[PDB]
Amino acid sequence: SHMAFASLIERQRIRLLLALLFGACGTLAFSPYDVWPAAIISLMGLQALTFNRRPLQSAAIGFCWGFGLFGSGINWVYVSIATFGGMPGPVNIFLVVLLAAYLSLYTGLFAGVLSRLWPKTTWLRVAIAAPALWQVTEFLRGWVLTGFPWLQFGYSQIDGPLKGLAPIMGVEAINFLLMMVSGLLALALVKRNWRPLVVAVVLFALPFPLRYIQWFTPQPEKTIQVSMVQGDIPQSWDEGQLLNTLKIYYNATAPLMGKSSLIIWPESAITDLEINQQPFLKALDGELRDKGSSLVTGIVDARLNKQNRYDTYNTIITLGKGAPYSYESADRYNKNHLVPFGEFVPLESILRPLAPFFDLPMSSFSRGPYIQPPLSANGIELTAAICYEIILGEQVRDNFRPDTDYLLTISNDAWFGKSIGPWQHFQMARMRALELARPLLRSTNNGITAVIGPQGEIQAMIPQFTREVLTTNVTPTTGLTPYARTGNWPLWVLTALFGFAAVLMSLRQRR
Ligand SMILES: CCCCCCCCC/C=C/CCCCCC(=O)OC[C@@H](O)CO
Ligand SMILES: CCCCCCCCC/C=C/CCCCCC(=O)OC[C@@H](O)CO
Ligand SMILES: CCCCCCCCC/C=C/CCCCCC(=O)OC[C@@H](O)CO
Ligand SMILES: CCCCCCCCC/C=C/CCCCCC(=O)OC[C@@H](O)CO
Ligand SMILES: CCCCCCCCC/C=C/CCCCCC(=O)OC[C@@H](O)CO
Ligand SMILES: CCCCCCCCC/C=C\CCCCCC(=O)OC[C@@H](O)CO
Ligand SMILES: CCCCCCCCC/C=C\CCCCCC(=O)OC[C@@H](O)CO
Ligand SMILES: CCCCCCCCC/C=C\CCCCCC(=O)OC[C@@H](O)CO
């Protein structure tokens, strides 16, 4: 003789469950599902479920929304933990839950702050304040503790109607517009009002023609045959296994010398120190040179520094024509942004004085500088990034030079097997080529090797989980996109105006 289904607390629990499901729906926006409308459905839920809530209730809803998104969208990290971590399966699940909860603090933060300063359900909350605040809370997610900016809905528009915005203001401009349009749709829905819907449709539609702009010019007098060797080496300290790996890569490469101007091996393809492989590298250099070809490859470089310690780098080196190999050559690239929990553990430097020496890792990776020159091979300028680094759009843009001919990324996504992880990673890699209007050569161990065209399109690809070479003709491009010239500071100016205007109005609403 009561209505327990209609209590205030129960209505809030219903919102938390829906938030969970609307968050998870957003995972469908990303590869390999590639249902870009799901990003709008997922953000509509976020914006609508937080209306007419107290701030702490809104924060809970935003946390649960994020938990659905990250819980369903980056649980592929389990595959690495469970295969290589040595830990009990329940510990592995809990670590993944912990990761998803951590990232959901930033969506709860967004929701809580939005509710406190813009409690009324209005077009200002959703179209002006929310985009600005989402930009700030997502920057923090990608910055705190080195950051993890995985699953930004703008990437889901690589093959969508908003892709033309990315070469002008970067992918974060697409995150901005999507939040704004999804908020206007949520507003139209709850107030049953057609005016915010029309506005939303116009704003969503205005960018459509930009997708037809080519900010670049092709250079066919520079077209070359490029080869990328996907060795598909399983994950491993055996010098024999090392030699079996050099055998696969060398024998796949030898018939391409004299035909492919550029040959590419993936991240850490040579699984030995550069100092222990001088005879191999200098012989290889000579074969490539005598046939007019160049080789770029990943390798681990423990380089003795002036303190007579070893900096261990995750490195790219060059050999052959136009890139004479040398241990002292500057024609190389050292990974700058290490993978959190992969190549380091955040907060480790603070805790190290107390750790027993026998428990510390044998070797830990050092960091190359934030800016490094393009690699040069066979006359070709290559702006390089290793693995996770390709998802850092501003950093890729900061290393880019107008004379860059190609973006280069080499990676090893074998850690995550047959999960959606490598596909999401591949999708973000495509956004860099669109933003900077250059082809991107992505060479991987077993995990989406491909040539991406200067508008983010897949020009060539080989299947995952195959030992095989991708060989094709590639053409470099020149020209500066607006985003390449400026970076993201124009979006920040817009964010500051939107946010200034919204905060001013919220303070006026009070007192
Ligand atoms: C029918 C209504 C009553 C049953 C449903 C109860 C209300 C909640 C349903 C939705 C749950 C929201 C998701 C919670 C997210 C966090 C989580 O579960 O644990 C993560 C943990 O690591 C946090 O520290
Ligand atoms: C080629 C041009 C492409 C760019 C189009 C991007 C559109 C988003 C940029 C900024 C838009 C300004 C904000 C307008 C929001 C106004 C608003 O929410 O009004 C709703 C209200 O009238 C409903 O009753
Ligand atoms: C207060 C609670 C503790 C601090 C806050 C939680 C922080 C997030 C917790 C994350 C735990 C581990 C996440 C999985 C890492 C997976 C991994 O190593 O991937 C990279 C690796 O495969 C690269 O070779
Ligand atoms: C550990 C100190 C206190 C807690 C802070 C840790 C959490 C903040 C830093 C972010 C962690 C993200 C964890 C997942 C990263 C692993 C991952 O992406 O694997 C590499 C993969 O992306 C390469 O394609
Ligand atoms: C962030 C919210 C949604 C997006 C709002 C912004 C919409 C921008 C629409 C497009 C504007 C075109 C910008 C001017 C580009 C022309 C220009 O710079 O010409 C010189 C060119 O060579 C630069 O590379
Ligand atoms: C008010 C209307 C009713 C609420 C529910 C409708 C909107 C949200 C849709 C519900 C759930 C989303 C499920 C899709 C995401 C799951 C998914 O693909 O996960 C894949 C991933 O786990 C693979 O590792
Ligand atoms: C890695 C450590 C994660 C700790 C997660 C604590 C939250 C547990 C979630 C349980 C129920 C849902 C309601 C949570 C509301 C508060 C919240 O999570 O975030 C609030 C946000 O303002 C944080 O800045
Ligand atoms: C596990 C993915 C479930 C897809 C269905 C979406 C609707 C349910 C709620 C959304 C996401 C899962 C939330 C719990 C956290 C996920 C987690 O720790 O998973 C670990 C496990 O999947 C690793 O294999």
Author numbering: -1 to 234, 237 to 511
Quote the passages of the study that discuss this structure, keeping the authors' original sentences:
A novel monoacylglycerol, 7.10 MAG, has been produced for use in the in meso (lipid cubic phase) crystallization of membrane proteins and complexes. 7.10 MAG differs from monoolein, the most extensively used lipid for in meso crystallization, in that it is shorter in chain length by one methylene and its cis olefinic bond is two carbons closer to the glycerol headgroup. Two distinctly different membrane proteins, one a β-barrel and the other a mix of intramembrane α-helices and an extramembranal αββα sandwich, as well as the α-helical adenosine A2a G protein-coupled receptor (A2aR) were crystallized in 7.10 MAG by the in meso method, yielding high-resolution structures in each case. These findings attest to the utility of this lipid for future campaigns aimed at the structure determination of novel membrane proteins and complexes.
